Design a binder for this molecule. Sequence first.
Ligand SMILES: Cc1ccncc1NC(=O)Cc1cccc(Cl)c1
Ligand SMILES: Cc1ccncc1NC(=O)Cc1cccc(Cl)c1
Lengths: 304, 304
Amino acid sequence: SGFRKMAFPSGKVEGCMVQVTCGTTTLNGLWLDDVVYCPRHVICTSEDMLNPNYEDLLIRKSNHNFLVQAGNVQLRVIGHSMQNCVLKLKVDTANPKTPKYKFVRIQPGQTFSVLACYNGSPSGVYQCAMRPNFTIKGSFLNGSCGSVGFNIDYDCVSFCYMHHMELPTGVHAGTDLEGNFYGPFVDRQTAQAAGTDTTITVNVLAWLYAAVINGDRWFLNRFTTTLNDFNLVAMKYNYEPLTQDHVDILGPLSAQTGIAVLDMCASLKELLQNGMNGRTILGSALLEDEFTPFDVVRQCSGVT
Amino acid sequence: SGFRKMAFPSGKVEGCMVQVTCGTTTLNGLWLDDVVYCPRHVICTSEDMLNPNYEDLLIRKSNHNFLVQAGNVQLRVIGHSMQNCVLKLKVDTANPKTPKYKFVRIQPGQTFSVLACYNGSPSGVYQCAMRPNFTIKGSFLNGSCGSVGFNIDYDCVSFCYMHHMELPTGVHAGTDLEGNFYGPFVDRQTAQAAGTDTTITVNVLAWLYAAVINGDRWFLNRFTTTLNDFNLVAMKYNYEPLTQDHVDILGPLSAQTGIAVLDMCASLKELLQNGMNGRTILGSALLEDEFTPFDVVRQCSGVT
Ligand SMILES: Cc1ccncc1NC(=O)Cc1cccc(Cl)c1
Ligand SMILES: Cc1ccncc1NC(=O)Cc1cccc(Cl)c1
């Protein structure tokens, strides 16, 4: 019993964190096999960030200008290349701590753990969601760039995110491990708009199922609804429209609790229209959307 | 910018997790140097838990009855002893992954990271507080017993908690690494009362300081208060009385923000008396008490 915002154990990722220095800028890199991945803005100075020509900037750099340090040992850089917004530094040594891994581009609404790092050293781990507007509400300071987001399936680490930038609104933006930004963001010191962000409806419903399982049932009512009626309410409250695909992934939780998905939707509809009236659900006074249906199943069954 | 419920990187602790089996019961153990620590209830059957005589139960067991498995390799048990509510299994091999460590008994209101484990395998990491009533609101299932709570200071892991029991109210109880329970709990299948739990006032004030630093300032008002006036309000709302010691630890945050501690108390007083009026602070619709003043300083400065 109990429900927590749980992150994956960060050990396999800690063994991959390195510090990358280029000139005066230092940030985090990910050392997998004989390649170090880091944000390409490591090659910029503060003046460059206003409007960087990354190709021209990288041309003034050689293998010896990239200082890669793993813990306390220096790695020899024998190759460098830019792929989208990431730099790939070929080193002469394969990381002995390289776990089984994959690079994956996650979908908005999906969750992942973040290992926040400074100077190649891990400082903390937290669980977050990729917002529908492709931003993350992380906790990152200067020096955190290159910190990564991941998921773990038994022994395989699926890297999904690399931190690049804090928008003027305090929210965060980054790339997949191929250097493609999630969202319309560019790695430039210019005001950039994150779109209107919506609440991840399917995740809120999954979290209401987690609440029923853990004993918080006060919100369950004698009502039901339809996908069309519920979506009229979701639209009014800036919730993502619920589709049959979302209903299908809620199936295991609906089977476990015996509460049909559309019945849970009617509870959510009443919570949206009436608020919580000063009550809490799973220790929260608001509707939580950072737990996918898979996260609820994993946590509620103890998957290691 | 941004403020998250961040846990310590769990890597140094993952390398210590083992599975301990005794008869038909399996739970988690902590392998440090040549000793495996686990809850003593590993020696009980379901029938024993109603009223166990642990000394009599342990006498029927020999070194060979304790099956300790680290990952996939078996450890040879050469000694066994009971210290309070923990079993200490001497193994013939020192854990090569033993980090620098200490055993510490934490105070109520202090925070720590938990590495939830099943069959000696880590499944998740979350940050929590030891409640003033010595319980923790964790996320633990059957098989999680022996999962540990810790803090990390540079390279030293301070182990502070071992999970033993879920109370009939869904809250959790456990021991320090010397087997002493936090609270009045006994490792027995009997209804046990956790006292009245209060909100950790100093942690809420530290979190309001984290809010001001990150931009959420709407709650700041034109008022001030005294320790005695504030404590009258704290008493009414079941908040821990604030002492000069608490004011002293809030000093660094007060210096950083330029908001005197008693001015922050007046904001908290108005929030307690008026609620949030539908607003949020750091993405929360309630007053958060799981961040100590040290956690706010560490997170807001990027301590690795
Ligand atoms: C200071 C900080 C805080 C949190 N995360 C990240 C940062 N750093 C930056 O955003 C630096 C920067 C500036 C313009 C473009 C890019 Cl790609 C990166
Ligand atoms: C089932 C479960 C869920 C979460 N944490 C722990 C558990 N397990 C137990 O509480 C088992 C037990 C029973 C009576 C006394 C003691 Cl010390 C331990």
